[PDB]
């Protein structure tokens, strides 16, 4: 009985919370997985 697995990445938990009450703000990003702008 061998698992025999060269790379294991069992879990990850990522929580992003962004809140903006912001006004009159302009910004170019190319990519935002989670962005508030």
Report the nearest approach of a second copy to the CB of residue 17 (Å): 5
For a second copy, how many residues bind (rule: CB under 8 A)?
37
Residues of span 1-37 touching a second copy by CB under 8 A: 1-37
Local structure of 11: helix, strand or coil: coil
Least distance from C-beta 26 to a second copy, angstroms?
Answer: 5
C-alpha span between 19 and 34 (Å, rounded): 11
d(CA 20, CA 34): 13
Binding site for a second copy (CB under 8 A): 1-37
């Amino acid at each position: 009985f061998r698992h025999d697995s060269g790379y294991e990445v069992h879990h990850q938990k990522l929580v992003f919370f962004a809140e903006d009450v912001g006004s009159n703000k302009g910004a170019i990003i190319g990519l935002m997985v989670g962005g508030v702008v």
